Every structure is written in structure tokens, then in C-alpha cells.
Ligand binder design. Structure first.
Ligand SMILES: CCOC(=O)c1ccc(OCCCC2CCN(c3ccc(C)nn3)CC2)cc1
Ligand SMILES: CCOC(=O)c1ccc(OCCCC2CCN(c3ccc(C)nn3)CC2)cc1
Ligand SMILES: *C(=O)CCCCCCCCCCCCC
Ligand SMILES: *C(=O)CCCCCCCCCCCCC
Ligand SMILES: *C(=O)CCCCCCCCCCCCC
Lengths: 266, 235, 279, 4, 62, 279, 235, 62, 62, 54, 59, 4, 4
């Protein structure tokens, strides 16, 4: 009653609040809300750290621009948040950490623009690489942080054998991993179709073959945003609109405290 | 010594069988399960999920992102079909590689109702009415809206609800159809036409994409497990 | 009972309820049935989804490896008097593709062994029946250097002694994973490179790989001493997952596999050419 | 058992 | 320890409920055959993972 | 109890009831018994029709196919290192004729496999025991191009691995028809020619035929690598219908079969010469 | 390990046997039955259906439609037999290919009562009386009506009821006769004679056909399943 | 799950009702043996498919 | 003489307590299989063979 | 049942009880558990010593 | 003769198996146990005993 | 026994 | 029987 709607939402976590007046409901991956490790599913015996509001708030990543040649963007979690305030600090001070996430993707335009973004949350998003060499993508390259990576329209094999790039070569219609993109819809997702909605909101549970794991060694979720239908406006052949990704860690807990992990990203 | 008599079948090995056998690592302490999210109980659950159709397999469009995109425009030839496709969910090149098509290529026989959902990806200022149809087998595959009108159909009106769903009802002579191509167990024809036309105002794109989706209605089932042609390996 | 829902008799409509329209942006698939958009009769449904259950889909023994082992006079150069196989479902493509519709799995495994042999050379007399030893070497255990060295004593390792011509050998293995489920996909590394590392080889790892030896190896040999004439044998290994559970569905592999990871190389063009308005 |  | 269950009888002879018997011979459950009496579930967690699940005859967007 | 009706004692008659006269034009067979036209004694009948029941009539395994497969060195010309058979009861005449007393049938099928082998040539040494793989390829599945290509991995197809000298292999198959009954006869086509067709080949079909592959094929091969000397083998297939039901009786085939349809060609003269008034 | 001892018969294959065996397509979803009209429970049901006898296997008549036609006429030689036939239901060339004869050639032994029905296909203006008979074995096969009269017989009077039935009662020494020819298990002789004669008026055909039929009475049974000589195939 | 039935005993030894035992070992009914206890039926649908069925001692035509 | 016991079921099928049956065929116990249901004990006789056993939070020496 | 003992939730300490100190001269092994020297959470243990039985 | 069908695994020998077998010295009079001190029920009991570490493995 |  |  009163005047409420599927399209209008407020998300509040910690000292952060998001409003949206043009949503398309919201997704909870596999019907499961984030939760803490139960005593009967626990494995590390040391008392956990639960930083709560200090880490379970919305961190906004650097904005990316969507233009007519944009092939697609990808992120990995927890990697995109490694440098985000006290969350990143907790991640690097402990051997173990689990966390769920609320992902909120933002992209508005006008009643006259056109285009549709496919936003997909993928458990264990193993991407493909550069080379003749199998499973050779270097740690530093596999992990772009906040920056994320991109998709390509075709497979360019990094030829230079002698001094290898050890990079991914994610081809768009193959979801960067040897399968057809049209089937990516079996994964938890939403579509930002500019005539319908400004944004997508997906709530991710912790998914893993384990109750808790090493966040520095392993990404649990991959976020893939691909243009299912290209951006278009009026007759202007060089339109560009911003895509902004805001993410919040949820029910975060950490085990195995010691000196801080300082990975080498060069 | 219990007197026994060995029957035929003795000492054979059937790949398809179900028997007990000795455990090679006795008394092993098994890691318990934890409640992982996303559990699947039946391959038909996957076929019920909407996945995007490669509707556009023309020379330069196929094996590209444009294979997923059907172009609608305000200046299209209204007498012509927007798209034409056969109801062969595991065999037709547009359907065979969808999640539904892929599960069906591991089985020999399919039965049940299917549903196609179409998404308008044009601007909000764009309008239009589209007729989408299904012709059960036995006659000339529809070439005009006049002909298509006469079979099972839906008239989709574009508006705030972005998408439309046409259910293809299970209408068959046989109780189970085949997953391969075969005139005897054929499914019929799907076609789309403009009912009125795409209309836009000025300062608006005159052309836009339509994305298509397919999934199984809850009466759908499959049988006779078999190997797929969708994968292989070299010597 | 396991039959699918019956079709309800459904008649004409003129209403504000519009099942036919929807919004896929939501992330949801429209729950429609034939009676929502056409007039339907009542059908008492008897069909069932019995054969597409997870167990039924996997309930078949699949070829995952062909091990070749010779029995001949021990000469001083590289021979195959014994062979070793790393246990995996990835040297083959068929079961791998089926297992990979899912991210995580949990099951017991059934191993069936088909053993065939033949004479290599035109003629040097013949061979008395061979007994084959298939020994499991879990990671850590001493591996054989020789076809008849001490490791084949197998005091704690499980071994199968198979006699040629007997019914194909069969054993069962429990769920043996270090985690609560087997990961068909692992988006990570076994080592992180640290800023303080001496060489930058220390922290290097294969992408997607977990432990180095995964589940160990099967060492195969002919226990018979060599005949004057040479016998060549092949041990074919059939794998069947049983008492199976699977989590988080994934799109099937659409292009040829290129090694153990998700890597692709060529034949990246799965789909046929077909006209947009062609049936 | 089931004796007919 | 004999377990007796019913067969889902497809083609019937010109002769009702028919049974089959099962006995586990080994201590380790991994040694056991597959029961194949399996329970099915809702597609919902994949087909409708919505926070506000809506009834099909109402507007998906409102 | 299943014995036939007893003969009743019946005496003289002088009456208006005339069982002996009738009119076959009606389409009916006159229900007469010996006591209707002759004086009969009382006989307590003990005979029964136990062996002419549908099940009993078919309760015998019949030879429906002889598959020949060789095991020899893979040369570069057409060989028989593997063979394929389309499953049918029509390559043979005996069971076909029995099954065809009826229009429709419904049954489970029992397949028994008898495997025999011999040496082709006078002499090149000998052969160790062979294991044969009989793989079922249901319509749609990849068929083999080679005796040891990837299709023989058989991950989802059912396969039997048979060892030479072991008891004849035996499996059971459910009622697998697309209809509610198997049609022993189909008065129709799989395609109708339409007026609007481009060539008139589009709508052409074989008369009486339904699907192109009916029930698929059995692919047979020797899993053994080749000996120096050649072994030729024959796999004989015995078919037995069980838990059988049949509908709409038909006159038995009176002239030799000429292919899968009802077509006849010659020996159209079944009946012997005999004099009208000759015993 | 239960101590067992293998008996003779072990590892054999008997064509005639009845044993369980592994199912090669586990958990298959079977198409249910529907109530088809015309179901048969026993091959003897078919032998109880009247089918037309090839009574006329003379040189130019056999393997022709005339093999089914016996000519009766008002000018026939009344002393002579209309037709003469042996009671060998699976062997006699006139009986062996009837539906009864055909089911019997799949069995070795027969027992029970048979019945022959004759149909007058002449004009309504035609009349006549016919004697049809059965002689149990052991004597000279009847050559005259005088002789035939003395055995089991029926005197058929032609009239509005077009047909007549003679039952051949089970009169045998053995409990089951053989389906092949054999003097030891022989069935006897069937003969037909004019009792008066065919009489027609003027402007009426003087000649006409008689059709004959045979089927089993309800006491008929068969045993020892065997292969038929009525079908074969070349190398 | 042992099913016990009676044999129709033909030649009797110089020694009443004799039985045989049956147990189904497999889940799929297709795997099963043939019971061979079969029910017989009327020939009527083939021997007398008449709309007005008439008694044999009366005129077939009237 | 059939002995029925429970299996400690590790990986469970999508179908509770599962059993296995055992029967000894031979008179001599040496002929028998291993039951593998084994009882565990305290390490105390090796880890703490003290005459005066002391509680861990108190001084070992006093 | 044969599973190993559960880990008890254990919190901070400031006391005269010193499990961490001992005297191995006694011939005895110190019976300590993680909760005696660190803060522990409650873990419901399911692991067992089934395969290391004699 | 009970009708039987031999399954795969038949006539194999698994080192890891657990089956009955004939006793080669029937009716032997076995020496009874006496209560020996120091009995062990599980190999983990040994791992719980403190043993001295080779902490210094220098040249 | 245990009849389900 | 003896069920433990
Ligand atoms: C990614 C690679 O493959 C897998 O993840 C995968 C593949 C196989 C698998 O099965 C379990 C593997 C370990 C088993 C392998 C077979 N084992 C044995 C043990 C004894 C004998 C004689 N024969 N085999 C014992 C341990 C479990 C997981
Ligand atoms: C007109 C032709 O013949 C028939 O109509 C007819 C003939 C045979 C028939 O039986 C079923 C045929 C399909 C079966 C054939 C045998 N099958 C298998 C399956 C696995 C293995 C190893 N071996 N055989 C599985 C499917 C059903 C109908
Ligand atoms: C429960 O099973 C009690 C009834 C036992 C019936 C006889 C079992 C016959 C098979 C013996 C199995 C021994 C397996 C190791
Ligand atoms: C009903 O069958 C209960 C009684 C069981 C008696 C012992 C059965 C012996 C055979 C075991 C059959 C196992 C078949 C898979
Ligand atoms: C206790 O065992 C009474 C029940 C017996 C059930 C049938 C046993 C079947 C196996 C016979 C064993 C004979 C061993 C020498």
C-alpha cells in the first residue's frame, strides 16, 4: 500500500546509503542471503575477527566509460576491493577471510538513448589466456584490482615466446572461458536495459568448496559486464556514458592473524 | 559349497550397470558436506532457465556477439518476416547450443512445452506491435503474416514491460519427439512479423536490437541418455 | 510418484492479468505454461524426469585413460616394463564436459579396469597367462624406479592383482577431497608472489591449479617375468561417479579443450551459418 | 516374502 | 538387512506391484550401488532468484 | 486352474433349434461344439492352452543378426576393424514372421550375444585372448569413423565389454518406442509433398517408413591391438521379446519377404497342387 | 566369501530359458500403454476365427482366386464326391495355410474338435440338399455317399440361412495328434455328396460357387513350440 | 522380497503341491524374467463382433 | 546367524541410516573377516604415567 | 559415534592458572589444547580417528 | 543349482580388501591372552606422546 | 529386513 | 539374526 515500488530502492550498509529510482527488482544469488560460519561448519579453531560496519559498507570503484566500441569489463572478488579501506587491511593481515557482497551497478542515460548491459555474477570465474602455454597467466596479471580487465572480440595469441606477457585474452562471445556467452544467464544476473532501468543490484553469498579460504590466493566471485546490445544515441556515432560499480562486503569474518601480506604487483 | 549355476551375462561388463564392489581405501575419514549455495537435483532444472538464443547466424554475424542481436527498424519491409526458425530444440543451429539445446543433445528423446521470450532493447521513446507465431507441422511454413496469423500466436505490444513471452504448447502425434532432425517427429515452425511497425520520434535511433530467449515449461522431459556431438577429441 | 504436472483445462480470457508480458531485466525467467496464453484441454500427465536426475546423468562408466605397459626382457634403455598415470578425468573429453556443467561436486568413484594384450612380433615361441599389478601411490609415497623394485611390495598402498582373461577388475573409492566438495574450477593460485621475495620465481604458480599431485598416481606393471617373446598390454580405465551431488551450474564447453585449464586455442567458431529468415 |  | 522396494513397472506382462531386493555386502558406503530413487527440487533458486518474488499475472515492473 | 471346458453329455434331438445352420455373411464364426450336432459323452477335460499364450509363443531367443569384425594390422584400405548394425528384427525371417501375426506390439527386449572367432591364415604366430566392445549408439550420437577414435570412450552411451570364452553376454532393454506401441506395419509416410514445394524431392519419403534411424545402431570392435596374425570374429545376436502384449491380428506372410516393407517379388505361388476329390 | 560349487549347465546358453539380466538403459521414462482395440491373449484365439479354405488346388485353379471356389451345378454327376479331404489340419495342402493351419505349423502336437462351415453362393432361386461327412480313421476312405452316410455327418438343406456347420468331434486314440503327416496319429476323412441335387428354375444360372471355412471348437489346444516350414531365407 | 508360487506339476515322482521361489535382483522391471502365469480371454471380439449378438440355436438371419 | 550393522555413510546420494549384512561361513574365528568397529582408548598410560597425576593449570612442580 | 572432541569457545585470561608452563622432567606430556593459550571459537568437530586404529 | 551371474571385480585380488577364507589349521588350541602392560588401540596415541625434536640440522 |  |  501507500505508494511503494519494485523500481525504487534504498540500500543502507554501515555509514553508506544508495538510492535508485529506476531499478528492476533485485537478485539474491541462488536464493541465499550472506551469512556467518556456523559452529558445525567451522574449521579454523581461533576466534574470528568480525570488523562489521568498518568493512561492510559500500566502496565505489573507479568509473569506466561505455562507448560504441566497448567490448566488456570484468572484475574479481575479493580482488577489486584489496585496497579498499579497512576491508583491504583485514584481508591482508589474516591468512583466512570470508565475505558475501552486495554488488550495485550504475548506468543512467536518457529516454532517447539505447543499449543493454548484461551484468553477471560468476562463482569461480576462471578466465583464458595469451598463449600456447597452458595455465600460464601470471598472478599480477590475473588480479587487476579495482581497475578490472576487459573483453576482446577475438583471440589474439601473444606471440612473443621469448618475453611472454602472461596475460588473459578473454574473448566476448566465449565469456572469456571457452563456453558460449548466451548461456551465461544460468549464472546469477541482471540486465541494465536503458529504456527500463538505471541499475542492477545483485546480493552475493560466499560460494566456495570450503567454509573459509585465503582471499589473497583465491577469488570467489567474478563480475562480468558485457554489452548485449550496443550503446546508441540520436545519430551521434561517438556517444559515451559512464558505468559505475559500487560494491559492499557483507558478513565478513577473518581468521589466522599475523604480520601483513604485501603481494608483488609489478 | 552352495550348488550354483552360472547364467548368460556372467563375467561381462556393462557400462550402464549398477553393482557393489570392494572399497580400496577402507575406513577412510570422509570430509563432511557443508551447505554450499546453488545445488542442482535434475538436469531439467537447467533447461528451465532462460538463456539467450543465437538468432542471427548469417555469414558475418555468426560466432560473433551480433549473432545474439536481431535488428528491428522503423523503415523495415513490413511484408517480410523479421525471423523464421524451426522447432527442433536440439538440432536447429539457432537452438542446439542454448542451455536447453545442450542438455537435449545428451538425450535421444524430448517431450513437453517450450517458451520463447523476446526483449526489446530499443530506446524508451520507441513503440511498436509485433506478431510472434507457432505453426504445428504438416503445411507450408509461413511466409506471410496472413499465413502465420492462423496458427498459435501472440501480439506483443512494446511498452514499460520490456519483454514478451510466447509459449509453444506441446502439440505432437508421438508421445516423445526425437532430438535429431527427422520429418516423422518434426515440431513445426516459428515466425515473427510486424503487426503495425516500429515508430520513433525525431532525435531518436530508427534502428535497434531485439534479444531472444528460450526455456522449457514445467511439463518438459527427456529420455535415453546418449553421447553428444557437441564435443570431441583428436588422436 | 514422480510424474510431471498435469495440463489444466483453460478457456478464453479478456482481463487485466497479462502473464504474456514481462521484464527479463529482473534476472528472472517467466514461469509460463501453455494455459497462460492459449486455450488448453485437461491432460493427465504421466511422463517423468527419472532419467535426467544427477545420478542418472552420470550413471555410466566412461573411458578416462589408456595405460600401455610391456612385458619383455629388461634391456638397458628406456622401456615400458611399468607405467604411471596421474589420476584425473581430464585426459579425455566426454566425462570432463559432463562433470563441468557444474562448479562443485561431491561423490564416491567407481573404477573398472579393462585389460587387453597382444603379441608384438611375428614369432619367438609364446606366453603363459599374465598377472598385472595396479598399485595406487597416494602423494608422498615412494614411486617405483624399476618394474620389480621394493615399492611394489605395497604394504600400505592399495594394489589390485588382475589375472588376464578374468572379468574386468573393479574397485570403489570414497569421497577423498581436502575440501567439502571437489572444485571443477578454481579461480586462483597455490602461491602468492610477495614484495620481499628473493627471485620472482619463488612465488610463481600455475593459474587454476591447486596441489601439485592432486590425488596421486596409478602404477601399472606385469608381475610375470619376461617370456622369450614380447607381449604388449593396454589397461583401459573406466570411471563412474556414484552417490553424486553437484553445485552451481555452468555453461557447457563450446570450443575444444586446450589442456587442464579453461584455455582455448583454436576452432573458436562453434556455430553454423544459417539465414535469419530461413527455417 | 509374498506367497501368491 | 534385506531392503525391499518397488519397481516402477513400464511394459507389463499379461499376468499389480512388483518388487526388488537389495542387500549391502560391504562395510564402506562407497562400495554401495546407486539407489536411484532420487528427490527432485524447485528451479526457483536459478529461475527466480528475486528478492521480491512476483506472481506471473501482475506487472514484472511496477 | 487353466484347463479347457469339459465336454457335456448330449443326447438325441428333434427340435426347432438348429445350431447347425447359420449365416457367415454376418461377419461371425459359428460358436459350435461337438454336442450341438452329434451325441456326446461327458469328458472331464484336462488339456490346457498354457504354451500358446503370447508370452510362451515368443519366449525363445531368435538369431536376428550376424556381425563380422576383424582384428588385424591397420592398413590404409577399407577393412573391418569395426562394424555397425542398425537394430532391427528384419534382416532375418523367422522372428519377423512370428511378430507379424500382429499389427501393434509392446514389450521389453532381451539381447544375448554369442561371440566366435578363428584364425584366418595358415600361420604367423598366435593371439592372446580378445576383449570385444559392443557400443550402442542411439540416433544423434557421434558414430565412429575409426576402430579406436574418441566415440569409443562411451561416456554416456551404453557399452558391453565382452571377454572371449566367457558365457554369452546378456542385457535387457525397456519398451523404448516413441508411440504407445511398436508398429509392425505403418500405412503412411514421414513427409507429405506440398503444392508449394520447390523441387518435388523435398516432400518425398519411403512408403511404410517412419523415422530414418528407427532405434540406432550397435557398433562392434575388438579392443585388443592387433596381433602379427589375423583373427576374424563373428558376433551373433539373439533377440527375445519379454513381458509382451500384442494387438490387431494379421494373416501370416505367405510369400518370401522382399525387403523391410510388405513388398513381394517372386515365388508368389505358395500352394501345392492337389485334386478336388483326392484325400 | 560364500562357499559355492558350480554345477553342470553352468555358463551355457539355452534359447528356451527364463532369467533376469542387467538393464542397459537404467531409469528410462517408459511411454505408458493406451487402450488399443483388438488385443490378443493366446494364439489359439486366432485358430478359433473362421478363415476361408483353399478347397480347389487343381492345376489351373491353385494360387489363384478360384482355389477358394468349389463349383456346384444342377447337372453334376450325383454319384461322385463334390470334394474329398484328409483331416490333417497343419499338413493337408488345403488346410495347412488357413489361419488354423498356420498357427498349428508353429507347434508339434494338436488336440481338439474342429468345425467346417460351408457357404452357398448361388442365386436365391436355387435349392438343394447336400450331405457333408467325417469318417474317423481305420477303414477305406469313402468313395460313395452310401459309405460316407455311415460316419459322422450333417445333411445341409439350402435356404435363407446361407451356411451350414459340420463339427468334426475329437475322436482319437492318442491324447495329442501330430501336426505332420503320420499314419499312427491320423485324423480320418472328410467328404461331401449331393443328397438330392441343385435345382434351379429357368432364367437362372445352373452353376455356382460354394465357399468353405474352418475353425477350432473351444476344446482345441496345441503344444511343443517349433519352427515352421512355411517361411525361409536364402544365403 | 521372495515371491513363492506353485508349479503345475506334470510327471509326478513316487513320493501334493510343489513350489518355486523368485527374487528380483534389479531395480528396472525390464531386467526381470517372464512370470508365465498368463490370463486368457474371450475370442468374441474377433469371432463375434456383432452389434446384435445372437444365440447359436436361433436363426442367424431373421 | 546374519549380523546387521550400520554404515558410517560419508558421501550421500540424493535419495537416513544405511546397513550392511554379515554372515560367518566358517567354524574357526581365524577364518573371519575384520569387523573394523574398533574401540579407542586414553593416551594416559603413555602421556601421563605419573604416580601423582596433576591438573594442567597448576604447577607441574610444587 | 567416533568423532574427536569439540573446540570450546574460550576468551581472555588474567590469572594464577598457568597451563602454558610445565616441567617435562616428570616424564609427562603437557595435556594442552588451543583454548589454553589462545582465544578460541566453538567448533563442532566431525573428524575421526577411524583409519588410524591398529 | 542357484542361478548366479558373475559381476566385474570377480576373481580379482585387492590388497585393501576384507574377506573370509578357509582356516589351514582347523581346531587349533590357541594360547589365551594375558594382561600385558602398555597396550595401544590407535596410532594417534603415539603421536600424542612428546618426543624430542632434531632442531639443529647444521652440517 | 527393511521394506520401504 | 543379530542386529547391533
Ligand atoms: C581435476 C582432476 O580430476 C578430479 O578432480 C577427480 C578425479 C578422480 C577422483 O577420484 C578419486 C581419485 C583418487 C582415487 C583414485 C583411485 N584409487 C585407487 C586406489 C587403489 C586402487 C588399486 N586403484 N585406485 C584411490 C584414489 C576425484 C577427483
Ligand atoms: C522394425 C524394426 O525392428 C523393431 O521395431 C524393433 C526391434 C528391436 C527393438 O528393440 C529395441 C531396439 C533398441 C535397443 C537395442 C539394443 N540396445 C542396447 C543398448 C546397449 C547395449 C550394450 N546393447 N544394446 C538398446 C536399444 C524394438 C523394436
Ligand atoms: C539382513 O540382511 C538379514 C537377512 C540376511 C538374509 C541372507 C543374506 C544372504 C547374503 C549374505 C550376505 C553376506 C554379505 C557379506
Ligand atoms: C525379500 O527378498 C526379503 C528376503 C531376502 C532373502 C535373501 C535374498 C538373497 C539374495 C540377495 C539378493 C540381492 C539382490 C541385489
Ligand atoms: C543365520 O545366519 C540364520 C539365517 C541364514 C540365512 C541364509 C544364509 C545363506 C548363506 C548360507 C551360509 C552357509 C555357510 C557355510
Amino acid at each position: 500500500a501507500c505508494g511503494y515500488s519494485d523500481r525504487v530502492l534504498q540500500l543502507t550498509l554501515g555509514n553508506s546509503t544508495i538510492t535508485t529510482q529506476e531499478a528492476a527488482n533485485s537478485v539474491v544469488a541462488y536464493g541465499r542471503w550472506p551469512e556467518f560460519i556456523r559452529d558445525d561448519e567451522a574449521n579454523p579453531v581461533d576466534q574470528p575477527t568480525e570488523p562489521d560496519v568498518a568493512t561492510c559498507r559500500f566502496y565505489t570503484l573507479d568509473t569506466v566509460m561505455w562507448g560504441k566500441e566497448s567490448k566488456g569489463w570484468w572484475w574479481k572478488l575479493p580482488d577489486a576491493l584489496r585496497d579498499m579501506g579497512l576491508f583491504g587491511q583485514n584481508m591482508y593481515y589474516h591468512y583466512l577471510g570470508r565475505s558475501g557482497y552486495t554488488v550495485h551497478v550504475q548506468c543512467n542515460a536518457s529516454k532517447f538513448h539505447q543499449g543493454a548491459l548484461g551484468v553477471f555474477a560468476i562463482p569461480e570465474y576462471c578466465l583464458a589466456g595469451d598463449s600456447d602455454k597452458q595455465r600460464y597467466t601470471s598472478y599480477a596479471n590475473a588480479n587487476p584490482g579495482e581497475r578490472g580487465g576487459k573483453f576482446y572480440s577475438q583471440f589474439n595469441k601473444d606471440n612473443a615466446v621469448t618475453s611472454p606477457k602472461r596475460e588473459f585474452c578473454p574473448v566476448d562471445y566465449l565469456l572469456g572461458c571457452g563456453v558460449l556467452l548466451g548461456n551465461a544467464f544460468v549464472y546469477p544476473h541482471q540486465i541494465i536495459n536503458l529504456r527500463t532501468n538505471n541499475s542492477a543490484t545483485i546480493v552475493l553469498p560466499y560460494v566456495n568448496a570450503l567454509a573459509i579460504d585465503s582471499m589473497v590466493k583465491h577469488n570467489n566471485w567474478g563480475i562480468a559486464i558485457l554489452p548485449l546490445s550496443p550503446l546508441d544515441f540520436a545519430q551521434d556515432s561517438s556517444v559515451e556514458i559512464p558505468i559505475t560499480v559500487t560494491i559492499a562486503p557483507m558478513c565478513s569474518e577473518f581468521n589466522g592473524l599475523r604480520n601483513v601480506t604485501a603481494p608483488k604487483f609489478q | 559349497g552352495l550348488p550354483v549355476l552360472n547364467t548368460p551375462g556372467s563375467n561381462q561388463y556393462l557400462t550402464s550397470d549398477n553393482h557393489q564392489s570392494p572399497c580400496a581405501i577402507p575406513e577412510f575419514d570422509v570430509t563432511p558436506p557443508i551447505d554450499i549455495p546453488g545445488e542442482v537435483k535434475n538436469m531439467m532444472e537447467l533447461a528451465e532457465i532462460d538463456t539467450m538464443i543465437p538468432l542471427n547466424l548469417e555469414s558475418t554475424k555468426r560466432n560473433t556477439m551480433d549473432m545474439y542481436r536481431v535488428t528491428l527498424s522503423d523503415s523495415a519491409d513490413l511484408s517480410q518476416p523479421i525471423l523464421c526458425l524451426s522447432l527442433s530444440p536440439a538440432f536447429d543451429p539457432r537452438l542446439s547450443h542454448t542451455m536447453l539445446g545442450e542438455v537435449l543433445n545428451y538425450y535421444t528423446h524430448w517431450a513437453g512445452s517450450l517458451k520463447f521470450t523476446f526483449l526489446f532493447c530499443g530506446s524508451m521513446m520507441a513503440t511498436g506491435k509485433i506478431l510472434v507465431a507457432y505453426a504445428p507441422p504438416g503445411a507450408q511454413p509461413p511466409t506471410s503474416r496472413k499465413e502465420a496469423m492462423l496458427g498459435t500466436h501472440v501480439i506483443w505490444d512494446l511498452g514499460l514491460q520490456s519483454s514478451c513471452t510466447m509459449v509453444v504448447p506441446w502439440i505432437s502425434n508421438v508421445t516423445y519427439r526425437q532430438t535429431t532432425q527427422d520429418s516423422f517427429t518434426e515440431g513445426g515452425y516459428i515466425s515473427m512479423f510486424y503487426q503495425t511497425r516500429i515508430v520513433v520520434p525525431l532525435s531518436t535511433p530508427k534502428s535497434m536490437s531485439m534479444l531472444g530467449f528460450v526455456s522449457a515449461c514445467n511439463d518438459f522431459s527427456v529420455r535415453l541418455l546418449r553421447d553428444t556431438t557437441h564435443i570431441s577429441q583428436s588422436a | 510418484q514422480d510424474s510431471l504436472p498435469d495440463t489444466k483445462a483453460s478457456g478464453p480470457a479478456h482481463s487485466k492479468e497479462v502473464p504474456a508480458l514481462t521484464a527479463v531485466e529482473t534476472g528472472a525467467t517467466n514461469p509460463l505454461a501453455p494455459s497462460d496464453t492459449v486455450q488448453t484441454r485437461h491432460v493427465v500427465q504421466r511422463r517423468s524426469r527419472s532419467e535426467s536426475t544427477i545420478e542418472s546423468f552420470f550413471a555410466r562408466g566412461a573411458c578416462v585413460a589408456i595405460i600401455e605397459v610391456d612385458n619383455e626382457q629388461p634391456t638397458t634403455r628406456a622401456q615400458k616394463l611399468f607405467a604411471m598415470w596421474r589420476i584425473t578425468y581430464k585426459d579425455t573429453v566426454q566425462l570432463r564436459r559432463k562433470l563441468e556443467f557444474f562448479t562443485y561436486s561431491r561423490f564416491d568413484m567407481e573404477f573398472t579396469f579393462v585389460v587387453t594384450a597382444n603379441f608384438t612380433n611375428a614369432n619367438n615361441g609364446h606366453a603363459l597367462n599374465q598377472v598385472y599389478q595396479i598399485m595406487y601411490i597416494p602423494p608422498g609415497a615412494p614411486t617405483p624406479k624399476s618394474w620389480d623394485d621394493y615399492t611394489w611390495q605395497t604394504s600400505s598402498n592399495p594394489s589390485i592383482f588382475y589375472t588376464y582373461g578374468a572379468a574386468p577388475a573393479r574397485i570403489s573409492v570414497p569421497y577423498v577431497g581436502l575440501a567439502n566438495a571437489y572444485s571443477h574450477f578454481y579461480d586462483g593460485f597455490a602461491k602468492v608472489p610477495l614484495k620481499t621475495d628473493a627471485n620472482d620465481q619463488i612465488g610463481d604458480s600455475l593459474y587454476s591449479a591447486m596441489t601439485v599431485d592432486d590425488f596421486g598416481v596409478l602404477a601399472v606393471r606385469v608381475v610375470n617375468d619376461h617370456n622369450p617373446t614380447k607381449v604388449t598390454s593396454k589397461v583401459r580405465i573406466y570411471m563412474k561417479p556414484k552417490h553424486v551431488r553437484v553445485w552451481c551450474p555452468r555453461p557447457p564447453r563450446a570450443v575444444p579443450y586446450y589442456g587442464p585449464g579453461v584455455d582455448y586455442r583454436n576452432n573458436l567458431d562453434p556455430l553454423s551459418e544459417k539465414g535469419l529468415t530461413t527455417y | 516374502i509374498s506367497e501368491v | 538387512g534385506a531392503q525391499v522396494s518397488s519397481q516402477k513397472v513400464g511394459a507389463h506382462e499379461n499376468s499389480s506391484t512388483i518388487n526388488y531386493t537389495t542387500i549391502n555386502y560391504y562395510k564402506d558406503s562407497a562400495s554401495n550401488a546407486a539407489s536411484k530413487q532420487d528427490y527432485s527440487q524447485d528451479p526457483s533458486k536459478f529461475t527466480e532468484p528475486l528478492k521480491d518474488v512476483l506472481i506471473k499475472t501482475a506487472p514484472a515492473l511496477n
